[PDB]
Amino acid sequence: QTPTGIYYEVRGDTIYMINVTSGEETPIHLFGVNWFGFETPNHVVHGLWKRNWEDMLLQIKSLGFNAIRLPFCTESVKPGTQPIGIDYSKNPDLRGLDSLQIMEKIIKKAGDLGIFVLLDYHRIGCTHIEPLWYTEDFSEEDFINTWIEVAKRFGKYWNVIGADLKNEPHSVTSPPAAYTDGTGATWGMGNPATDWNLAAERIGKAILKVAPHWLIFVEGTQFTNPKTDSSYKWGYNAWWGGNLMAVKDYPVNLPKNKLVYSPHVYGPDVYNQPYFGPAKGFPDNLPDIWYHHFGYVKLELGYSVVIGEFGGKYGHGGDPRDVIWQNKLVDWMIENKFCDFFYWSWNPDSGDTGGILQDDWTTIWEDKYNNLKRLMD
């Protein structure tokens, strides 16, 4: 049931790593970071114009992280795709390698450091996050076939825990139109061509056929269906990939022991949500909002919930409420035992969030990290 001898599964709401030969099981927690770049025109994780790739992984490990979420686009996982923006004096062992080979080298090195890797099909093109898992020139079959090829190749790396099926299903128009106009993802609306809960089953099933040992990470949508979204006062103000309110009545039809729900959640640096106003009760109003959008999926329904993205500038060149926001979110995660997450991002070159690293790609933001470090202990 595994090409590596290692099998990942959810027991209760906790992820376990199973050695199938010895029978040994260990619960694991994912203290993760997003290192992005393979999903961009660079076709490689960013920062290698300033840093050595291995030094980066060591620095990540040095801060107590044990997991990396690795966004990719279709092109980066095809042989022959050339990366742009590498300083080869700092990265001599990367000379001659295409994007796929660098991805392999990074995953293998991460594994050597005991770092788990989650593969994230972040973009179909390499420019922006499409609202759906297909485009006019790239069909759902093309999407699934790509995942199959990725699972065949990377399923052989022991430390790859699975597949984040599609980054941030979302809408590009407003409701109630968004539910039916076919431009955006839905959940429980009924049309299997827009319903992410149905698509996730189709894509997930295909992956589990070739990588039965993997977990399937399924993000939220932005809007689900009018009955669900209208059932809660802040039902129309969830993030892309962050609306899991339809899980209760419309659960994804996959084996529970292989499924992880993976919401994204953000603060005032990404969008000035009305509920970030003290006028609306910020920040003491946040736990109930998080609980409704996604928290109940673990606390009430007992599924594995892993926060796939969260982050913000933490008062460095952004909205100073972000400091309060990130502190409250970490407090809530600790209190409710959400111990699995991927911070967005390791990279500093994220326009609305910044990262763990500062713009010099070398020094970390001490305060931002100190808060996060609380989740690690």
Residue numbers in the entry: 34 to 410
From the paper:
The hyperthermophilic endocellulase, EGPh (glycosyl hydrolase family 5) from Pyrococcus horikoshii possesses 4 cysteine residues forming 2 disulfide bonds, as identified by structural analysis. The crystal structure of hyperthermophilic beta-1,4 endocellulases (EGPh, glycosyl hydrolase family 5, T opt = 100 °C) from the archaeon Pyrococcus horikoshii, that was isolated from an oceanic hydrothermal volcanic vent, has been determined. The crystal structure of EGPh revealed 4 Cys residues (C106, C159, C372, and C412) forming 2 disulfide bonds. The disulfide bonding of C106 and C159 forms at the end of the loop associated with the substrate-binding active site cleft.
To investigate a role of the disulfide bond in the activity and stability of the enzyme, we prepared 3 mutants of EGPh; P74C, C106S, and P74C/C106S, in which we removed the disulfide bond or changed the disulfide-bonding pattern. In the mutant P74C, we paid particular attention to which pair of residues among the 3 Cys residues (C74, C106, and C159) would participate in disulfide bond formation in EGPh. The structural data demonstrated that the substituted C74 residue formed a new disulfide bond (C74–C159). The newly formed disulfide bond (C74–C159) in EGPh was located at the conserved position for the disulfide bond (C34–C120) in EGAc. The conformation of the newly formed disulfide bond in EGPh also exactly matched with that of EGAc on the superimposed structure. The neighboring residues around the Cys residues were not affected structurally by the mutation. The structure of P74C with 3 Cys residues near the active site showed the same disulfide-bonding pattern as that of EGAc, suggesting that the conserved C159 prefers a linkage with the substituted C74 rather than with C106, unlike that of the wild type. The Cα–Cα distance (5.0 Å) of C74–C159 was also slightly closer (5.7 Å) than that of C106–C159. These structural factors may allow the conserved residue C159 to easily form a disulfide bond with the substituted C74 rather than C106 of the wild type. The wild type enzyme was thermally unfolded at 103.4 °C. The melting temperature of the 3 mutants was approximately 101.5 °C. These results indicate that the alternative new disulfide-bonding pattern involved in the position of P74 did not contribute to its hyperthermostability.
